[PDB]
Amino acid sequence: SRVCQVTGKRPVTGNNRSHALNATKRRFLPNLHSHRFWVESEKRFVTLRVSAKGMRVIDKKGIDTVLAELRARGEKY
Amino acid sequence: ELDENLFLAARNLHKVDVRDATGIDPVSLIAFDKVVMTADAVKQVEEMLA
Amino acid sequence: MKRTFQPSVLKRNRSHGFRARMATKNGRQVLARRRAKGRARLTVSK
Amino acid sequence: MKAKELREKSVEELNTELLNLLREQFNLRMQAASGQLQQSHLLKQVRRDVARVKTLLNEKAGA
Amino acid sequence: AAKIRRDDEVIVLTGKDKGKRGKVKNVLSSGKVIVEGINLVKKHQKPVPALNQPGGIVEKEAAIQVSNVAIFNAATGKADRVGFRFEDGKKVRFFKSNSETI
Amino acid sequence: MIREERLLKVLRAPHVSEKASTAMEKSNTIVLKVAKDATKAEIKAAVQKLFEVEVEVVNTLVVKGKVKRHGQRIGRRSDWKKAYVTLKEGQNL
RNA sequence: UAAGGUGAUAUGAACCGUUAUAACCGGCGAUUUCCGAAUGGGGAAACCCAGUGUGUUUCGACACACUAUCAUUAACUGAAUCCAUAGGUUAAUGAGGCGAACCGGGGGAACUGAAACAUCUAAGUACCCCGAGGAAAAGAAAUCAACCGAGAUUCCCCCAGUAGCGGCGAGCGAACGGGGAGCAGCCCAGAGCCUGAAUCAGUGUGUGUGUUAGUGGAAGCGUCUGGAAAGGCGCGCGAUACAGGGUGACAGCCCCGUACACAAAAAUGCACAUGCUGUGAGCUCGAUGAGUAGGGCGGGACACGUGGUAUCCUGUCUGAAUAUGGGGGGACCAUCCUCCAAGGCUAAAUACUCCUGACUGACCGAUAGUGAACCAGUACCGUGAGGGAAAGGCGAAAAGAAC
């Protein structure tokens, strides 16, 4: 899949465009590392699909608001 | 002339159709014999052809 | 000589029979092209 | 036989098959093989009327 | 509504012998009527499997088109067109020619 | 109680067979038709309730359906059940 | 609605008759075996083999009601672990499979054109997969404009083979603006006042408008030629109807059809009125769109090969302000204009034709037109996916085989 869910990123097409300037493909892939949390909204600990520089968004939105957004995105925790 | 009801037929009698002065066609003036255009319709057609 | 074709229908049924085509994605499309042609020999193989 | 009976309850009409037609229903089987009954009306009367009670048995679970 | 059927007599318009009231013996699902006292066909038919018999033919009445026969008018010895459902009262044939049945 | 009389869809018309139709058809053996759905599990008691007689031995077979008729494209008899039944007495209505 | 009918090839017994459901046909219901989505579960397709629920022993398991699966919601059950959760289950709601095309998304070519070839082009097109409505999709300004104005979208004719991109080559081609078809606008980011007002939805019913099962619809004869007239002769009759099929030679008056007039116990497409049941208008005071915008790095898509590259998108880097605020006006700076992004609904002009109904051909006529006018997607070819033939019109009538 290569889906990160927290920042919603997807792999994207992209061309190499380097010397001798052939029209060959190169692509770009985003990252996914996954992480374990304590959330207080639950009696248990949970694991979420999250990425490098993506956990920076949890500090903006609040952990309970990301727990609810990933629930609205159908995630299993 | 054009009537409320009498705007259609004869047809099945062959070589016939009923027609009014609006958009008078040149085929009606040569594809048949002695046309039944009236002494008042000749005045109406002069105002449609200027 | 032998013209690459043996007498055995068990070898045919297991690939071209109704259960061997209706269960597979492309075999269930052979059945649809057969119907779309109007062909009476839909799958045979028995 | 009726096919509709308003509030007369169909639970009592199953007896028509299980007792009242019994020992005459389909009785020409094995016992007659010629087709020469000479009662071509009776063979049409022993058909379709038994289906109207089956149309009425649709509501038989009502109480 | 359908014409001729079997109860009426016909005066005949097709290329057969005319001058008599054709009585309808039978009507066919092929669009034909069989008329008595009008025309005959020969037919000798297939012989029997045993063994020596005299010569003889069937000689039977002919079928003609139900659409080229016209019904006898019961007034002037001729045929007439009839019309369907009269303009007043009960559902009956119009009998255009003189407005009377039989 | 136990079962209803819908079990009694047993035996169909007699047919011709040199094993019966020669000297046995009203005294030992008769060859019968059988319905597409009918019991072979309670057949000894089903005849005992519908025809009210006992049968000692009965075997059921189909042999072969012929396909060679009225062709055009050739018409078939299909398989249908036939039985060699020991009823020992005649029945007509 | 009619006297012949119990389908047909195929007759006939017997019986229903010829009025009361003979026979046939339409609306809207009851249903619809087993395999198949296939769906208790399993197989060598139509077979075999189980469970829960209801009732029961006339006494080696019947016969009815139910049991596949995903998510949502609801209710049972249930570990490490106390609460909890994971695991184990049932049920309604929407979907499921088969289509013809129109329609939204995912992945995604190469012959080719450049008389070669790498950038460009073939093209986000084909193809394979998925989704979804009767239409989809689009939309109610951080839009365009040009110092004057327009004031949501869609398509058609134009703007224009122009402004412009490009081994500057082959290709590709705007935007403003105009003519026309067409045009109700509206809710959230919450909770008050006061009410159930705006605007709808579902079904019922009334009314209008469309389509229905169905019924009616004008006139001619004899003689002559011939096998026979629809043609000749004698002349009459009709015509919103002398389109078409014809029929024994050429029919308005013989048949079917046509122009026309009626009809529906009742169904069903569209739009209002209205009961029931959900929905709920205005004004006030709050809340006011953030990992977003601006700006780098490397690319994609925009006519535009990154260039003077704005725009739209973002793998990656940096990351606000939020009204002494912020976007855009094809780099950038300034001024001025013009809007207020980072949330949804949605007219109609539009697309297509499985299907319904009306209808036509200076088109073909059996080596044609579909491969197929006919037991043809059959015969037949091949392990198979797949490929695929030959075959039309007696006569007025079997009058077609007596002896």
From Swiss-Prot, chain B:
Q: Which GO terms describe its cellular component?
A: cytoplasm; cytosol; cytosolic large ribosomal subunit; large ribosomal subunit
What Gene Ontology terms describe what this protein does at the molecular function level?
A: DNA binding; endoribonuclease inhibitor activity; mRNA 5'-UTR binding; RNA-binding transcription regulator activity; rRNA binding; structural constituent of ribosome; translation repressor activity
Per the UniProt entry, the effect of V16D is: Does not regulate the S10 operon in vivo
The protein's UniProt keywords, in alphabetical order, are: Antibiotic resistance, Repressor, Ribonucleoprotein, Ribosomal protein, RNA-binding, rRNA-binding, Transcription, Transcription regulation, Transcription termination, Translation regulation
Q: Does the keyword Ribonucleoprotein apply?
A: yes
Among the record's GO biological process terms, what is one? transcriptional attenuation
The reply to whether Acetylation figures as a keyword in the UniProt entry is: no
Question: What interactions and quaternary structure are annotated?
Answer: Part of the 50S ribosomal subunit. In TnaC-stalled ribosomes forms part of the binding pocket for L-Trp with the leader peptide and uL22.
Entry's family note = Belongs to the universal ribosomal protein uL4 family.
Q: What else is known?
A: The erythromycin sensitive allele is dominant over the resistant allele.
The function of this protein is: One of the primary rRNA binding proteins, this protein initially binds near the 5'-end of the 23S rRNA. It is important during the early stages of 50S assembly. It makes multiple contacts with different domains of the 23S rRNA in the assembled 50S subunit and ribosome.
Q: What is this protein called?
A: Large ribosomal subunit protein uL4
Q: What is the lineage of its organism?
A: Bacteria, Pseudomonadati, Pseudomonadota, Gammaproteobacteria, Enterobacterales
Q: Which gene encodes it?
A: rplD
From Swiss-Prot, chain C:
Q: S-adenosyl-L-methionine: present as a keyword of the record?
A: no
Extract the InterPro entries matched here.
Ribosomal_bL34, Ribosomal_bL34_CS
The name of this protein is Large ribosomal subunit protein bL34
What are the UniProt keywords, alphabetically? Ribonucleoprotein, Ribosomal protein
The organism of origin for this protein:
Escherichia coli (strain K12)
Family (UniProt): Belongs to the bacterial ribosomal protein bL34 family.
* Gene Ontology biological process terms from the UniProt entry: cytoplasmic translation
GO molecular-function term, one example from the UniProt record? structural constituent of ribosome
Record text on subunit structure and interactions: Part of the 50S ribosomal subunit.
Query: Where in the chain are disulfide-linked cysteines found?
Result: none
Example GO CC term: the record gives: cytoplasm
Gene3D superfamilies annotated for this entry? 1.10.287.3980
Which Pfam family, an example, fits this chain? Ribosomal_L34
From Swiss-Prot, chain D:
Pfam families documented for this protein: Ribosomal_L29 (PF00831)
This protein's record includes keyword Cytoplasm: no
- Record's InterPro entries? Ribosomal_protein_uL29, Ribosomal_uL29, Ribosomal_uL29_CS, Ribosomal_uL29_sf
- Swiss-Prot/TrEMBL keywords: Ribonucleoprotein, Ribosomal protein, RNA-binding, rRNA-binding
* GO process annotations (BP): cytoplasmic translation; ribosomal large subunit assembly
Any one cellular-component term (Gene Ontology) = cytosolic large ribosomal subunit
Family the UniProt entry places it in: Belongs to the universal ribosomal protein uL29 family.
What does the subunit section of this Swiss-Prot or TrEMBL entry state? Answer: Part of the 50s ribosomal subunit. Contacts protein L23, trigger factor and protein nascent chains. Might also contact SecE and probably does contact SecG when the SecYEG translocation complex is docked with the ribosome.
**Role noted for this protein:** Binds 23S rRNA. It is not essential for growth.
Put simply, this protein is called: Large ribosomal subunit protein uL29
Q: Give the source lineage, highest ranks first.
A: Bacteria, Pseudomonadati, Pseudomonadota, Gammaproteobacteria, Enterobacterales
Curated annotation (Swiss-Prot), chain F:
An annotated Gene Ontology molecular function: rRNA binding
Which keywords does this Swiss-Prot/TrEMBL entry list? Ribonucleoprotein, Ribosomal protein, RNA-binding, rRNA-binding
State the InterPro entries in the record: Nucleotide-bd_a/b_plait_sf (IPR012677), Ribosomal_uL23-like (IPR013025), Ribosomal_uL23/eL15/eS24_sf (IPR012678), Ribosomal_uL23_CS (IPR001014)
Q: Where are the transmembrane segments?
A: none
Q: Its GO CC terms?
A: cytoplasm; cytosolic large ribosomal subunit
- PROSITE patterns according to UniProt: RIBOSOMAL_L23
- In UniProt terms, what is the effect of altering E52K? No effect on trigger factor binding
Q: Could you mention a single GO BP entry for this protein?
A: cytoplasmic translation
Q: Does the keyword Acetylation apply?
A: no
| Entry keyword annotation includes Metal-binding | no
This molecule's function is given as: One of the early assembly proteins, it binds 23S rRNA; is essential for growth. One of the proteins that surround the polypeptide exit tunnel on the outside of the subunit. Acts as the docking site for trigger factor for Ffh binding to the ribosome (SRP54) and to nascent polypeptide chains.
Listed under subunit, the entry gives: Part of the 50S ribosomal subunit. Contacts protein L29 and trigger factor. Might also contact SecE and probably does contact SecG and SecY when the SecYEG translocation complex is docked with the ribosome.
NCBIfam families in the record, alphabetically?
PRK05738.1-1, PRK05738.1-3, PRK05738.2-4
Family label:
Belongs to the universal ribosomal protein uL23 family.
UniProt name for this protein: Large ribosomal subunit protein uL23
- List the top taxonomic levels of the source: Bacteria, Pseudomonadati, Pseudomonadota, Gammaproteobacteria, Enterobacterales
**By which gene is this protein encoded?**
rplW
